Each structure stands twice: as C-alpha cells, then as structure tokens.
Design goal:
- The chain is an alpha+beta fold.
- It has nine helices and ten strands.
- It has two domains: 64 residues, Phosphorylase Kinase, domain 1 (2-Layer Sandwich), CATH 3.30.200; 209 residues, Transferase(Phosphotransferase), domain 1.
- A hairpin with an 8-residue loop joins β8 and β9.
- α3 packs antiparallel against α5.
- Bound molecules: ligand 37J and octyl beta-D-glucopyranoside (2 copies).
- The ligand O=C(Nc1nc2ccc(C(F)(F)F)cc2[nH]1)c1csc(NC(=O)c2ccccc2OC(F)(F)F)n1 binds next to β2, β4 and α2.
- Keywords: ATP-binding, Biological rhythms, Cell membrane, Cytoplasm, Cytoskeleton, Disease variant, Golgi apparatus, Kinase, Membrane, Methylation, Nucleotide-binding, Nucleus, Phosphoprotein, Serine/threonine-protein kinase, Transferase, Wnt signaling pathway.
Length: 293
C-alpha cells in the first residue's frame, strides 16, 4: 500500500500528463477517489510546482479542475485533484471515432468558453487537444473541463495587459497534429493559436481523422511532413461535407493578428446559430449518453 500526503492512498495509472502521469487515488479521510499527478524529482526540468501554481490561478472558473493538495514527497512531486470523467479522446474512441454534428457543436460551445477563460486570466494553453478536455462526474457529467497546464504560459502582463513580443524561431510546443500553422512556422504562440487548434480538434471529431494524420517516416521528417501537409490543405477540402461554419471558424482564427483579442462571442454564435438552425435540442444528450458517469 502506497500513501502520499499522509492522506491519500495511491492507486493505478489512469493516464498520461504533459509532465507526470495521472493515478487514481483515495482520500482516506473523506472516503472519496481523487486523481493524483506524480512527477519524478530526477526528471530533467521539474515542472509540477509551476503547473500547480497555474491551476491555483485558474480556480473558480467553470470547467477548471479543483486542486485538493500539492507537495513534494521524497522522489516525487505530487498534485492531488478532484477526479474527473473520461477525456474527449476516450469518448471519441467509445463512439467509434465519429461524433454527430450535434455533439460536436455542444462540445465547441464549451470548449471555446474554456479557452476564453484561460485567456482572461492571462495565459495561453498551447496544447489544445481532445486528451486535454474531460467530462465531469455526477451532476457535472455534461460539463467539459480543460486540463493540463504543463505547457501553458503568460501571453500578457497581468497589470498592464501588454502583450508579449512577437518573435520567431520557436521550437514546436504542443501536439503536431493539432498545432496552428504559425506554430509549425516557429512563430511565438498567442491566443489565436489555441483557437486554431480547437478548429482542428472539431474537424477531427467531424471527420474521424485529419488529412495530415498517419504520415510515415530523421530529426524529424515526420513533423515536417505534417507541417507541409497541413499548410497545403485547402480549408474547403478539409471541411467538405460539413457545414460552412467550420471553415468560417478556421479562416477567422487563421486571419487573427498575433496580438489580436479573438471575438470569442462571434465564434460561439457561429456554432450556436447553426445548432438552432438545424433544430437540435440543447439537452446535453451527447453521443455517449448511454454511459452513466
Ligand atoms: O482521466 C480520468 N480522470 C481524470 N480526472 C482528472 C482530474 C485532474 C487531472 C489533472 F490533469 F491532473 F488535472 C487529470 C484527471 N484525469 C478518467 C476518468 S474515466 C477515464 N477513462 C475512461 O473511463 C475510458 C478510458 C478509455 C476508453 C474509454 C473510457 O471511458 C469512456 F467513458 F469514454 F468510455 N479517465
Ligand atoms: C477513474 C476510472 C478508472 C479509469 C480506468 C481507465 C484506464 C484506461 O486508461 C489507461 O489506463 C491504462 C491501463 O489501463 C494506462 O496504462 C494508460 O496510461 C491509460 O491510458
Ligand atoms: C459500462 C459499459 C461501458 C463499456 C465501455 C467500454 C468501452 C471500450 O472502449 C473502446 O471502445 C471500442 C471497443 O473496445 C474500441 O473501438 C475503442 O478503441 C476502445 O477504446
């Protein structure tokens, strides 16, 4: 039996994290399960304390995981969080890697709002991907949460709101599959890039895979092939067979200037108007609704 924080029983691994994997655990006192993130202290660049600080700054926002405890204990840095439900990637697989339009639009609405919230607190996320959105549990089972602040960083000064400077020659940060075109080009990430990535996530959900997925290969040619393919795929080819709003969303995000504040409301309204034009009911009945978590 393994214990951390003189309070939590450590269980088995439930997932990966940017830096440190995630384990199920039990809060022995409260008789409740929790999620426990562990980072090895001999890791080359320890990050967990920084990440926990970001979670603390995000607290109180809708769809932000609650921190219960953080501390170092011997060979591990430990972060204990409220347990959440499955990831959108888990649920996508459950659903045979295709979501209905209704589900994609219900998800888009919340996901835009999560990103907007992180931006409002002065950070960019930098790794918007299905694995980093989790559904809640119980009464919050239809709430989408955003997680993993391991790659996040400030994009503006907290007092003046002066934007970070434009620069280039940046190494890739985040998943190549969902990176913005400017991220592939080595441009410093900013708010538009989180939103562009979300655009690719929504098309991934619509399509089942993206055109730059499953390319094969030095240091390496794989990322270069992804970048080249993504950069040369016409939006209208990517989005063929799906409502025009998906291409409108992507063109909008791509046209944002480096320091522009995105019109989040416009983007949410694009999808909401479509939702209601289609005559969907906003009843939070997702494709996985037969699962009762
Ligand atoms: O990861 C889960 N919880 C979780 N709560 C967290 C709280 C904070 C953090 C943080 F990042 F440290 F902040 C991470 C967390 N991770 C979780 C709960 S259930 C599950 N996975 C399936 O049920 C499933 C797996 C594979 C295929 C299908 C799956 O379920 C379902 F429902 F999709 F079919 N994963
Ligand atoms: C909180 C409910 C328990 C979640 C169980 C889902 C576990 C499946 O998911 C996973 O567990 C694997 C082994 O099972 C690990 O090796 C992987 O890191 C992880 O993807
Ligand atoms: C309580 C009943 C819910 C059963 C949840 C099990 C979901 C298994 O999960 C999955 O679904 C498919 C079938 O294995 C596969 O295509 C996916 O890759 C796999 O991840």
């Amino acid at each position: 039996e393994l214990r951390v924080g003189n309070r939590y029983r450590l269980g088995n691994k439930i997932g990966s994290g940017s830096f440190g994997d995630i384990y199920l655990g039990t809060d022995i006192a409260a008789g409740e399960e929790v999620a426990i993130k562990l980072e090895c202290v001999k890791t080359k660049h320890p990050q967990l304390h920084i990440e926990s600080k970001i979670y603390k700054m995000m607290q109180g926002g809708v769809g932000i995981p609650t921190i219960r405890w953080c501390g170092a204990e011997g060979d591990y840095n430990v972060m204990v969080m409220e347990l959440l439900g499955p990831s959108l990637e888990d649920l996508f697989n459950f659903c045979s890697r295709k979501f209905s339009l209704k589900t994609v639009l219900l998800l888009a609405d919340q996901m835009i709002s999560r990103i907007e919230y992180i931006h409002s607190k002065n950070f960019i996320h930098r790794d918007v991907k299905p694995d980093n959105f989790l559904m809640g549990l119980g009464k919050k089972g239809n709430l989408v949460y955003i997680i993993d602040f391991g790659l996040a960083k400030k994009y503006r000064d907290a007092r003046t709101h002066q934007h970070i400077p434009y620069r280039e020659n940046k190494n890739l940060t985040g998943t190549a599959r969902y990176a913005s075109i400017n991220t592939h080009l080595g441009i410093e990430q900013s708010r538009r890039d989180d939103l562009e990535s979300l655009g690719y996530v929504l098309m991934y959900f619509n399509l089942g895979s993206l055109p730059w997925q499953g390319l094969k290969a030095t240091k390496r040619q794989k990322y270069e092939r992804i970048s080249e393919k993504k950069m040369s795929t016409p939006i209208e080819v990517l989005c063929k067979g799906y409502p025009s709003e998906f291409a409108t969303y992507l063109n909008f995000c791509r046209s944002l200037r480096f320091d522009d504040k995105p019109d989040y409301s416009y983007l949410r309204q694009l999808f909401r108007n479509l939702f209601h034009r289609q005559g969907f009911s906003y009843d939070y009945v997702f494709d996985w609704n037969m699962l009762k978590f």
